[PDB]
Amino acid sequence: MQGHPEVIDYLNTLLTGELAARDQYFIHSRIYEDWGFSKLYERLNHEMEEETQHADALLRRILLLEGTPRMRPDDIHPGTTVPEMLEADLKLERHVRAALAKGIALCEQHKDFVSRDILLAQLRDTEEDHAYWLEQQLGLIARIGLENYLQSQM
Amino acid sequence: MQGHPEVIDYLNTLLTGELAARDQYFIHSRIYEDWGFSKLYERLNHEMEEETQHADALLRRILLLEGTPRMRPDDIHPGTTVPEMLEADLKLERHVRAALAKGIALCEQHKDFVSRDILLAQLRDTEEDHAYWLEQQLGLIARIGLENYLQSQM
Amino acid sequence: MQGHPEVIDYLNTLLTGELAARDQYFIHSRIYEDWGFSKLYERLNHEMEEETQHADALLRRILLLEGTPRMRPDDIHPGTTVPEMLEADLKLERHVRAALAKGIALCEQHKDFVSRDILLAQLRDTEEDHAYWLEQQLGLIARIGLENYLQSQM
Amino acid sequence: MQGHPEVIDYLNTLLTGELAARDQYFIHSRIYEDWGFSKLYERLNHEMEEETQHADALLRRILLLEGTPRMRPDDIHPGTTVPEMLEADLKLERHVRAALAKGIALCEQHKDFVSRDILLAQLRDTEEDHAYWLEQQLGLIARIGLENYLQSQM
Amino acid sequence: MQGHPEVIDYLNTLLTGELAARDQYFIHSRIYEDWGFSKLYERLNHEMEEETQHADALLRRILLLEGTPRMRPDDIHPGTTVPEMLEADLKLERHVRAALAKGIALCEQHKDFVSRDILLAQLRDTEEDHAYWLEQQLGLIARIGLENYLQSQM
Amino acid sequence: MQGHPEVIDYLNTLLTGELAARDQYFIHSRIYEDWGFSKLYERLNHEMEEETQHADALLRRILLLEGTPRMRPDDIHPGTTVPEMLEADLKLERHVRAALAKGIALCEQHKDFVSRDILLAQLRDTEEDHAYWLEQQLGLIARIGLENYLQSQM
Amino acid sequence: MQGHPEVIDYLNTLLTGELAARDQYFIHSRIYEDWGFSKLYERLNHEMEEETQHADALLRRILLLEGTPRMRPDDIHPGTTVPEMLEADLKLERHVRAALAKGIALCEQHKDFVSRDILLAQLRDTEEDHAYWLEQQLGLIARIGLENYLQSQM
């Protein structure tokens, strides 16, 4: 019935982080669309939808463990150029990865293995999809130049 | 091109209000699903998406007018019982309706008729769909009793 | 080529009665819809359309008998609560029943057998569908209580 | 919630005007049909249905603004000849057009923009479909002759 | 039956402006096609057809208001290079935007609300599609260079 | 590569003549449509589209010959009555027919046979479709009467 | 039956030129495919087939006129770089265009109008398709640079 308060409180820290991540992707994707980079809009819009699902999974788990979800998003750090927005989004995923890894350890100490399994799925997406794609973008800019990279994102 | 600063700031005021309304629906809908009221989950889940669409419309208009969107949501005031959560949502929508109506008058005053037309569509949804449904729910409770109303929301 | 003036005048009295019934069903169905009882709205909106077809048959018969139709509907008295609106409709239907039965006898005495037949079909609908349905609703309210009845009409 | 009494009251004036318009198109279409002018009947039968929809919109709007809809239709002024009936319907459309325009102005003054938007849609129909068609019918009679026009309406 | 002469005259000024815009899009799209930029041809050929539909709506409204349309298009000044043609189109669209906004205010002051509505839809297309697209192209040229931009328009 | 200046110049004279023809069919078709003559509107709307295509062919031909297309339409001379509008369009077709014939001769003299072939196709249309139809309409009015002709064009 | 000897010899002159043009496209298209420019291979492969069709048309006309076709192709002058190969093809097509135009004049002089019409179709393809496309390619290179142009031909 009732989850551990240490676990519940840490899930809430991740929830406010994921609500923030969803809103950062929201603004970035619409700035990308405003500038005419439709391929950057579509990928970031998809990531915004995925963060809503990640936050949803955490929200419902907190309610199941009888906790009170914290719905105030943490602050966001939007950039002003494509290289900057890509870097800010990679730094976000890096903080998310560290926080998710520490929550997985915490769930193991408190023997909340179902909450660990939920965090592990989100960590996989963070490393193998989000952060992986973002490092590809930055490495392509370095290899083909910003003019060519931006042209390909129209 | 560039909009009037007063119109852009007011659009940003409506944007932080709608980002908050979307988050109030997120929590309310998931509380409803956790309690097992699937019809209230589905309505309020649909309303959260519609608010995300409303916020996206404001967000893209602010960017088109060369403005900077404010992404920190307003404070939310969730409820703890179905009557409270419905009243809190009704109170939110009354505020949004007054705010959109004042924004429509302002847009007319500064001759930004496209911004006016975007707000008019949102004002229609607020009165004819959101506020209309919530007042129906509160009227149903008063007429059939909370026990019967909650049973019909399973 | 021309009908009896007594029969024309009575078809006209029936016509203004049926235009009134259509408009009472018009307002009652929309009040039911506004309160959120969609099954009551759907049933009363269908009875509105049936009254318009009933009025239409009398209107065309009056013109075929070389008469001039009276288009001013009778005054209506809608209720303000579900029990009052059901009683107001049952009262109207009972007057319509007696008016139709009186006109059938009038048509039989003036040997207008086609006008008698038009009125019998309307009488049969008035008795076997409308008043029967209304009498059922009032019986159900007494058996299951108004609260359960309204819940079932959502 | 609660609309402005001046608005609710003016919507009720338009409502009785529109219920009368529906009944004038009712009698005209059936007279046309009795005379054998099927094309005039279909068109005016279609306008009766459109006027019923316009009335529904106003009635549901009055109920949302917490008002009491008035169901007594205004007086109708039918014609006895095709030229007269056409002229009668145009006069009604012209009166309706002026009525809707004053209400649009009144709604703006009281800041009920949704009620205005409902009225603008009806005004567009009154001007771009109804009155346009009537004026066309009258110009056609002037150019090709009534005998020819009526033949074409068969 | 008749419109205000001031509104008729302003719709006429708008009409000659939109006939001109159609013919500028006509020549620009064909120059783009001749140079081998098929994506620029397809986009500008579609905007040509939209201007003809815009001109058509004004032309019919002028005739409905009992006015006489002015069919002499305004003079146009097409460019000779891709950057000049994009700037020439953006300049025209900015004048069209201001002319439409001025006519909307004119229609509101003379209570011609249907003519106001026709103009708003054209304003919305002028701002949210045309000028938005043109401003995007000029932004892309600055980010990726004219050489890459033209290659992408082949 | 480079066409003969006398040819390029004469194609530009035909171009402005054809852009004017497109605009005359534009206003005529919409006047016919405003009056309720749907068959005349469809036919003349179709001719406006065919004239736009004829203009496209000349414009693309001028661009291939490395010339600069002239986009200022010639003056148009619309009528106010059906008989006058028909006569006006025939006069225009007759002027166009003579113009196209002189150009065909000019192209042969300068040995640009492709430009001649484009012109012969347009001449065939001008004579075998456009002028033929107009003459038919006028002969019909003479035989069956204008009242009957107009009825048939409804 | 039998054609004029001067017309037959000129057709044979055009035939050896077109058999050469077909072979120049064969080598050029296969050089393009070997370098990996598949879009240039496919266009120039299609042009080789079209020239084979043009030669077949001349061949069959010469036989029908009781002539003897000359099957030795003219000398070809292939290029060694994409700019050279495009220029060499443009130079070839200019020669064919002048040769077909002179042949059309000759056919008219000897009143062989069918032979003229066969040459007119080939002259149209030469100017409007072959030469038009090649000048587009050279213009694209001048506008986007050879590196970008060659990339787009992969």
DSSP secondary structure, G32-99, as one string: HHHHT-HHHHHHHHHHHHHHHHHHHHHHHHHHHTT-----PPPP----SSHHHHHHHHHHHHHHHHHH
Q: Under the phi-then-psi rule, with left for phi > 0, alpha for psi from -120 to 50, and beta for the rest, what region is B35? A: alpha
Q: Are F80 and E69 in contact (CB under 8 A)?
A: no
- Closest by alpha carbon to B20, among B80, B75, B98? B75
In this structure, what token pair is assigned to residue C8?
Answer: 């024309």
Task: Tell me the backbone φ, ψ of residue A76, rounded to 5 degrees.
Answer: -110, 155
Cβ <8 Å between D149 and F151: yes
- Sequence-ordered alpha helix ranges (H) in B36-131: 38-64, 82-109, 113-125
Cα A50 to Cα A23, A74, A127, B30, distances in angstroms: 12, 18, 14, 17
- How far is residue G6's CA from residue F147's CA, in Å, rounded to a whole number? 63
Chain C residues inside the 8 Å CB shell of D45: none
d(CA E147, CA A37): 17
CB C14 within 8 A of CB C103: yes
Q: Do residues A56 and B30 make contact, with C-beta atoms less than 8 angstroms apart?
A: yes
Query: What's the rounded Cα separation, in Å, for the pair A68 and B80?
Result: 10
Cα Rg of chain E, angstroms: 17
End-to-end CA separation in angstroms for chain G: 50
User: Coil, helix or strand for E70?
Assistant: coil
- For chain B, the maximum distance between any two Cα atoms, rounded to a whole number of angstroms, is 55
Instruction: Report helix, strand or coil for A74.
Output: coil
**Contact status, residue A144 vs residue A150, Cβ threshold 8 Å:** no
Given a contact cutoff of 8 angstroms between Cβ atoms, the answer to whether F112 and F3 are in contact is yes
- Residue G123: closest C-alpha in chain F: F114
E15 neighbors E70 (Cβ within 8 angstroms): yes
Chains F+B touching (3+ CB pairs under 8 Å): no
Whole-number Å distance between alpha carbons of F74 and E153: 33
Could you give the CA distance from residue E52 to residue G41 in angstroms, rounded to a whole number? 40
Burial (CB < 10 A; 0-12, 13-18, 19+), residue B116, is buried
> Contact B16/B70 with Cβ under 8 angstroms?
yes
Report which DSSP code applies to E4: -
Q: Cα separations (Å) of G5 from E101, G63, G72, G113, G116?
A: 73, 12, 19, 15, 15
Question: Of B108, B125, B127, which to mutate for an interface test with D (greatest number of D Cβ within 10 Å)?
Answer: B127
Entry field: residues in chain E: 154
**Of A142, A3, A117, A133, which Cα lies nearest the Cα of A68?**
A3
- Distances from the Cα of E42 to the Cαs of E29, E47, E48, F15, in angstroms? 7, 9, 10, 22
Contact B139, C35 (CB under 8 A): yes
**Chain breaks of chain B after residues with C–N above 2.5 Å:** none
Cα D19 to Cα D7: distance, rounded to the nearest angstrom: 18
> Of the candidates F78, F25, D128, which has an alpha carbon nearest to the alpha carbon of residue E52?
F25
Residue E17 to residue E14: CA distance in whole angstroms: 5
CB crowding B119-139: b at 16 or more within 10 Å, else e: bbebbebbbeebbbbbbbbee
Which chain F residue shows the shortest CA-CA distance from D142?
A: F147
3-class secondary structure, A100 = helix
> Which partners does chain B have (≥3 C-beta pairs < 8 Å)?
A, C, D, E
- Give Cβ neighbours of residue D20 (< 8 Å, ≥ 6 apart): D73, D74, D75, D76, D92
- Helical axes A5-35 vs B38-64, angle rounded to 10°: 40
Q: What is the SS3 assignment for C101?
A: helix
Amino acid at A10: Y
Q: Which residue of D has its CA nearest to C48?
A: D52
Give the one of B63, B72, B76 whose C-beta lies nearest to A71's C-beta. B76
Could you give the CA distance from residue E134 to residue E153 in angstroms, rounded to a whole number? 13
Could you tell me the two tokens for G113? 């109008």
Distance CA F146, CA F37 (A): 13
How many CB atoms are closer than 10 A to CB C116?
A: 18
Query: What is the rounded CA–CA span in Å between residue E120 and residue F122?
Result: 40
| Inter-residue contact E100 to B87 (CB < 8 Å) | no
- Whether the CB-CB separation of C7 and C64 falls below 8 Å is answered with no
Q: Considering only CA atoms, which of D27, D80, D67 is closest in space to residue D51?
A: D27
Q: How many CA atoms lie within 13 A of F152 on its CB side?
A: 9
Contact in structure between F119 and F104 (CB atoms under 8 Å): yes
Closest by Cα among E96, E19, E14 to E51:
E19
DSSP H or E run through A111: none
Interface test mutation site (partner F, options G100, G127, G130, G135, max chain F beta carbons within 10 A): G127
Decide: D24 and D78 in contact? Cβ < 8 Å. yes
Nearest CA in chain D to C67: D31
Amino acid at B123: L
Task: Write the Ramachandran bin of G111: left for phi over 0, alpha for psi from -120 to 50, otherwise beta.
Answer: left
CB C19 within 8 A of CB C74: yes
Write the burial class of residue G71 (CB in 10 Å: 0-12 exposed, 13-18 middle, 19+ buried).
exposed
Residue linked to tokens 């346009």: D132
Q: Give the closest-approach CA distance of B142 to chain D in angstroms.
A: 17
E29 close to E49: Cβ distance less than 8 angstroms: no
Which spans in C36-131 are helix H?
A: 38-64, 82-109, 113-125
Quick one: which of F57, F44, F154 has its CA closest to F90?
F44
Please give the full DSSP string across E104-131, using - where no structure is assigned: HHHHHHTT-HHHHHHHHHHHHHIIIIII
Distance CA F61, CA E97 (A): 34
Closest CB to E30 among F30, F60, F73: F60
Residue in the block written with tokens 């927005």? A85
F6 C-beta neighbours (distance < 10 Å), count: 13
Residues in chain C: 154
Question: CA D15 to CA D22: how far, in whole Å?
Answer: 11
Phi, psi (degrees; rounded to nearest 5) at G63: -65, -45
Quickly tell me which residue has 């600063």 as its tokens. B5
Q: Cα separation of G26 and B99, whole Å?
A: 71
E46, E54 Cβ separation under 8 angstroms? no
Contact between C35 and B151 using a beta-carbon 8 Å cutoff: no
DSSP state of G153: T
The DSSP code sequence of C2-45 is: ---HHHHHHHHHHHHHHHHHHHHHHHHHHHHHHHT-HHHHHHHH
Cβ atoms of E108 and E50 closer than 8 Å? no
Count other Cβ atoms within 10 Å, centred on residue E81. 11
- Cβ–Cβ < 8 Å for C63, D31: yes
Assign residue C66 a region (left: φ > 0; alpha: ψ between -120 and 50; beta: otherwise).
left
Residues of C in contact with D27 (CB under 8 A): 59, 69, 71
Pair C74, C16: CB distance under 8 Å: yes
Instruction: State the alpha helices, DSSP H only, in F36-131.
Output: 38-64, 82-109, 113-125
Q: Under a CB-based contact definition with an 8 Å cutoff, are residues B25 and B44 in contact?
A: yes
Q: Tell me the two tokens of residue E43.
A: 């986009």
Is the Cβ–Cβ distance between B86 and B29 less than 8 Å? Answer: no
The amino acid at C84: E
The partner residue sitting opposite E114, judged by closest CB among D94, D105, D124, is: D124
Which residues from chain F sit within 8 angstroms of residue D145, using beta carbons?
A: 147
What value, to the nearest 5°, has the Cα angle with vertex F118 and ends F115 and F123?
120
Query: Using an 8 Å Cβ cutoff, are C115 and C61 in contact?
Result: yes
Q: Which of B91, B75, B65, B70 is CA-nearest to residue B5? A: B65
d(CA F147, CA B16): 66
- The answer to whether the beta carbons of residues A51 and A21 sit under 8 Å apart is yes
> Could you say which DSSP state residue D65 is in?
T
- Answer whether E40's CB lies under 8 Å from E77's CB: no
Element of type H or E holding E133: helix E132-152
Counting every residue, how long is chain A? Answer: 154
The total of other beta-carbon atoms located within 10 Å of residue C10's CB is 20
Closest CA to G61 of G112, G130, G26, G137: G112
Resolution of the structure in the document, Å = 2.3
Contact present, G67 and G8 (Cβ < 8 Å): yes
Please report residues of E whose CB lies closer than 8 A to that of A34: 136
CB F132 within 8 A of CB F26: no
Length of chain D: 154
- 8 A C-beta contact, residue C35 and residue C148: no
Q: Where are the alpha helices (DSSP H) in chain D?
A: 5-35, 38-64, 82-109, 113-125, 132-144, 146-153
The alpha carbon of D66 is separated from its chain's Cα centroid by a whole number of angstroms, namely 25
Tokens of G132: 């038009």
Give dist(CA D62, CA A94) in Å, integer: 55
Alpha carbons D51 and D69: distance in angstroms, whole number: 16
Touch test D–A: 3 Cβ pairs or more under 8 Å: no
Give the residue among B45, B39, B43, B31 at the shortest CA–CA distance from B153.
Answer: B39
Q: How far is E44 from chain A (nearest CA, A)?
A: 17
Six token digits for residue C153: 């009409």
Residue D106 corresponds to which amino acid?
L
Contact D74, D16 (CB under 8 A): yes
In chain A, % helix, strand, coil (3-state, to 5) comes to 80, 0, 20
Find out whether B93 is annotated in a ligand binding site.
Answer: yes
What are B's interface residues with C at a Cβ cutoff of 8 A? 136-137, 139-140, 143-145, 148-149, 151-152
C85: which 2 tokens?
Answer: 């609106």
Dist. CA E94–CA E131, nearest whole Å:
7
Q: Which residues from chain D sit within 8 angstroms of residue B121, using beta carbons?
A: none
Q: At C115, phi and psi to the nearest 5?
A: -65, -35
